[PDB]
RNA sequence: CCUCCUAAAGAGUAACGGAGGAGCACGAAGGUUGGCUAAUCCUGGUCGGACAUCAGGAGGUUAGUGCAAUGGCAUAAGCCA
RNA sequence: CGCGGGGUGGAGCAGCCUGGUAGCUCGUCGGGCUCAUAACCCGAAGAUCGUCGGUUCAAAUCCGGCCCCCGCAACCA
RNA sequence: AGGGCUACACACGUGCUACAAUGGCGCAUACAAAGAGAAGCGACCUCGCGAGAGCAAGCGGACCUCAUAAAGUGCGUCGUAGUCCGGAUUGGAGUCUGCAACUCGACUCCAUGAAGUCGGAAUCGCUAGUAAUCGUGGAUCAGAAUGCCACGGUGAAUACGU
């Protein structure tokens, strides 16, 4: 697993965002399995979802490239910033922390 | 010299110092002087050969620095080990104690450098 | 022997068998039968019944109610 | 020398029968002291060794030199014999007299810890220790007020065992190390 | 250095086990959360163990240790750091 | 041009044949007289360091040799006065 | 299996005329400073001076082997 | 119930304290405001080196205690020595509230002992009973501030120019 931010630091701004997950391999033939966290009530209206629209969006990419079999995901944190997040954003950055992660981890 | 240790001051008064025989603060060397029969402070250039040493010695009833310290060293080991906090700290090398850390300590860590915890 | 220094015993042997400023017997330890060791065993080797420092004697009969100054 | 007086009268005619020789001629005995006081580095200096042969100069009536590095590991400017020490090589009389002002005026010097090493000893009938101070004899009770520099020691003896050179001189009132 | 008031703590719920534990034995430990309360002469020449916040670590009481709370028995914590820990050791 | 090997046990002796040195140094690094004896490892102690020194033991000359190296060197051809 | 020059801290470069580490400058790092950063200003750190071996009390520096870079030699007919 | 909020080679914002001598130390010694106290505050007196404890007048505070407020004033002493300064650190022992002072509280005594020699690029408060500088009290509070809120003591320099 992992923890992906898109933060920056240089200009005025902090263009802030950030999530971390779990993503696990499971045993051969168990497929694709799901789970959040901080959608009990902080991430979620909308936002439950989305995270798992951005998974969904996250099998159009990878190393390889596609599709996700097997493992089991789980949603541990993150922060939005309220004036510049929304449901998503969440999702576009949750198939960046995916596919992240999947690069540092090997697929 | 030595009475202290061959070290004896320095023109001092002391009641000052003596105190370089260690173990022995302003109170301790009045203390004894003190005790010793002499002081207090008197300039020690002032006292003769026999009043000093006569105090020393009088002097002790106390141990010698080597250890005062060590007993000291051996506290600390121990103190350690024994394995309380502390013991642990001293170990490590620091501050035993209550004090903290994040500030501060520095006394201890010595000067400072950046971290590579 | 191009003798550079003179050795001499009597100022330095004479009246040794006592401490004093220019002249001991003996060294700490040894002759001097000194102890050097270190122990622990805090308050259990003493009486457990220890008190501060008081106006009052052991097992007294009373105690002044602040309360009771009106 | 005193000390060697009562050796010979009194624990030679011991140590005959406690070693239980064939002959008085195999006793053990002191040969030398041959010292060096190693403060090393001083070529670069020169005061200091000068120094180091001025408190040597108050040890004994014998003349002060200089000891020489042979592997010479640190360097200066000199090749191999830079100078290091200043010796005073005593034996019989001159190295008995010292001894004996050992626990007698230098008792601030020598202390229970920094005693005769019991365990330092050895069959050939070889001997060394520190002293890590200069410890003078002058013709009265007197102290130089000086300090920094130390000396450091080297004995041979007639010892045939490291037995025997626990049994040498150790009657005296010395300290021994534990 | 640090003091504290004389007569130190005993603690009762360790001590419902010290009288308990001498007649057993050990052949396990004493464990206990007390910690804090002090060693006493006790509960001496036994294993015990004290929690920590998490799990129970044991340590034998000889002692030497009275007058000690049960706590300094255990640390509580770990760090990471400059330290942390000895140099050493291997794992 | 010198030393070892090429070089073949009287002797001489080649090839851009294999290795190394020489372009000076010394008024002490000379004469003479007396005496002395090592690299290295182990042992022993600490301000004494680092793995550094004095001493002892083993070693029994390997060291030393004004300048690389062979030959030689203790009755020293080495070393000190 | 030639010859000449080169091989320096993150990066460029000085040196050597047989030696006694770490220079100069940019960068880096902390600090002053700014709303903040470039940047000015203050201060500090770095490194198997290609490498292994040789000489020496002491080698980045002198010297041999070897690895790497660049240039030269590299046919007349 | 126990642990953690307090861990630790870091950095910063804000505060404290020292480096002394128009200062420290020992002795003698002068002049305050304010505030809390009914399971609370507290003198005289007694005990201990002391925190503190005992004994106990007084009081609900214009009736009492903190309290000889300290700086300041008188006298001896120090000569720049890392001190007669500083006293972080660190060993030992005693006192206190509380169920309990191990990690991790406060106070007292003995001993030990370090940086610090008035401090860079730089910077901040203040126009007079102000700043600078000395001490005191309270909320909060079982206990427990170098912060906060309020108090009184001594008490400046300089203000051309814009």
Known sequence: KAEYTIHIEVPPNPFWASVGLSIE?????????????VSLGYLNQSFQNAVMEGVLYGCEQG???????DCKICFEYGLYYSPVSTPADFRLLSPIVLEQALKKAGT | ARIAGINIPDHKHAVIALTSIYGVGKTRSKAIL???????DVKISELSEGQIDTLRDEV??????????????????????????????????????????????????????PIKK | MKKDIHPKYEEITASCSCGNVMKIRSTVGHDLNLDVCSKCHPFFTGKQRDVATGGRVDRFNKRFNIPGSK | ??????????????????????????????????????????????????????????????????????????????????????????????????????????????????????????????????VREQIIFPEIDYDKVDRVRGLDITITTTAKSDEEGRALLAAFDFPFRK | PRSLKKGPFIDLHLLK??????????????????????????????????????????????????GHKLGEFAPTRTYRGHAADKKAKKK
């Open chain 4, 1 to 130: 020398a005193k000390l060697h007086d009562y050796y010979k009268d009194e624990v030679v005619k011991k140590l005959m029968t406690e070693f239980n020789y064939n002959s008085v001629m195999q006793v053990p005995r002191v040969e030398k002291i041959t010292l060096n006081m190693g403060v090393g580095e001083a070529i670069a200096d020169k005061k200091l060794l000068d120094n180091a042969a001025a408190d040597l100069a108050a040890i004994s009536g014998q003349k002060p030199l200089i000891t020489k590095a042979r592997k010479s590991v640190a360097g200066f400017k000199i090749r191999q014999g830079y100078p290091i020490g200043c010796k005073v090589t005593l034996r019989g009389e001159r190295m008995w007299e010292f001894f004996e002002r050992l626990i007698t005026i230098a008792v601030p010097r020598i202390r229970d810890f920094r005693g005769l090493s019991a365990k330092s000893f050895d069959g050939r009938g070889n001997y060394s220790m520190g």
């Open chain 5, 17 to 66: 086990k010290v009288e308990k534990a001498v007649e057993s034995g050990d052949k396990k430990p004493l464990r206990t959360w007390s910690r804090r309360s002090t060693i006493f002469p006790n509960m001496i020449g036994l294993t015990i163990a004290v929690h920590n916040g998490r799990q129970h670590v044991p340590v034998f009481v000889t002692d030497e240790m009275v």
């Open chain 2, 60 to 113: 002790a009833k106390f141990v010698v620095e080597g250890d005062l310290r060590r007993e000291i060293s051996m506290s600390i080991k121990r103190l350690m080990d024994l394995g309380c906090y502390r013991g642990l700290r001293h170990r490590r090398g620091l501050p035993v104690r209550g004090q903290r850390t994040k500030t501060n300590a520095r006394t201890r860590k010595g000067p400072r450098k």
């Open chain 1, 63 to 69: 190393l390889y490239g596609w599709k996700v079999t």
């Open chain 2, 34 to 40: 003190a005790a010793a029969g002499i002081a207090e």
């Open chain 1, 25 to 37: 391999p499971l045993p051969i033939g168990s497929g694709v399995q799901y789970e959040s966290r």
